[PDB]
Amino acid sequence: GSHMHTQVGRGLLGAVVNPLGEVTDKFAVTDNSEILYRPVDNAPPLYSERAAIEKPFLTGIKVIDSLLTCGEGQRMGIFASAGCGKTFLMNMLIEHSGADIYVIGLIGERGREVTETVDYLKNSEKKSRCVLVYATSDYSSVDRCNAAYIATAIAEFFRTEGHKVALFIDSLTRYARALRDVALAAGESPARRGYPVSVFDSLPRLLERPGKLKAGGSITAFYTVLLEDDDFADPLAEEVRSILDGHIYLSRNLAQKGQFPAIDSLKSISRVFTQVVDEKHRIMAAAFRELLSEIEELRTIYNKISVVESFLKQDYRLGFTYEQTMELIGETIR
Ligand SMILES: [Mg+2]
Ligand SMILES: [Mg+2]
Ligand SMILES: [Mg+2]
Ligand SMILES: [Mg+2]
Ligand SMILES: [Mg+2]
Ligand SMILES: [Mg+2]
Ligand SMILES: [Mg+2]
Ligand SMILES: [Mg+2]
């Protein structure tokens, strides 16, 4: 029973907040200083309170805005091994999208990693729209957990205000590991992979707090899962794969090969694709995948590779409008 409240409001915009609710850096100063307190534990919305996911959440990233289109209110998994560009991708998603407010939660990262992110925010137009909650690796399992809840809570308040909120949580694997430790310390039995069954049981309550509301406002959430290399095939990834509305997988093959972002579209899916894009889009996109699968058949030892790879590849500094992306799609299937 967390009776613990935390600060929420426009006064946090620009702020870097720690697991104890105090501000330790800024990447922007905000003209408003609204601060209220709100509970860090909160039930997800009632089913009757949710709106259908129908309007797309545009990312300004060609390959996902076209083949893996996201909806406002959705929850999307990001599954990456190390050094495959995951943090560049998170930063792309923040930069080239159109949310009113971005809440980021970094869980158990090294202080260098939290600084990468803060550095990014300090040089970005979104600086006045973001809040960063972190728990560096010198913090306790409890503090790491509360970092995730504080992040969600702040998002929740901005959603109740009406805003289109984007929530990023990096990582769920360190959140789960911290939750595990808390559970072992309370004396419960380890199920498969040393995790007490309660860590996986609690996930839905955390991961279903996002969504779009009838009353106005939405949280669209991106959750990171750090993969090992073919190690145990990964219980947590599977759980997340099943709880969420789709998953983007970052490929090693594509990462070493220079193909950034290293998004493998074969291993990826938005489970709300059908219902956030045109009939026209579906067909153009379906045609692009056909073009892909066939280009993959040549990769077993024609000229439309350069043009396609040029479509996929995208420097983290560039954002493409939906029209631009679809414009580009049209020329590769014509
Ligand atoms: Mg786009
Ligand atoms: Mg990151
Ligand atoms: Mg400490
Ligand atoms: Mg709350
Ligand atoms: Mg994991
Ligand atoms: Mg583990
Ligand atoms: Mg499945
Ligand atoms: Mg239609």
Numbering used by the authors: -4 to -1, 84 to 380, 398 to 430
Task: Reproduce text from the manuscript describing this model.
The T3SS ATPase utilizes energy from ATP hydrolysis to separate chaperone proteins from effector proteins, unfold effector proteins and eventually force them through the central channel of the secretion apparatus. Using a crystallographic approach, in the present study we reveal atomic details for ATP binding by the highly conserved T3SS ATPase Spa47 from Shigella flexneri.
We performed a screen for truncations and eventually identified a variant lacking the first 83 N-terminal residues (denoted Spa47Δ1-83). Spa47Δ1-83 was highly soluble and eluted from the size-exclusion chromatography column as a monomer. In the unliganded structure, two Spa47 monomers are present in the asymmetric unit (ASU). Using PDBePISA software to analyse the crystal structure of Spa47Δ1-83, we did not observe an oligomeric assembly, consistent with the results of size-exclusion chromatography. The overall structure of Spa47Δ1-83 is similar to that of other T3SS ATPases, including the monomeric Spa47Δ1–79 N-terminal truncation. It includes a conserved ATPase domain spanning residues 84–354, and a C-terminal helical bundle domain spanning residues 355–430. In the unliganded Spa47 structure, a number of water molecules, and a SO42- ion occupy the P-loop. In the unliganded Spa47Δ1-83 structure, the side chains of the catalytically important residues K165 (Walker A motif from the P-loop) and D249 (Walker B motif) are connected by a salt bridge. The luminal loop is located below the P-loop and exhibits relatively stable folding, as demonstrated by the observation of sufficient electron density for this region, and the average B-factor of the loop (residues 305–315) was 81.9 Å2.
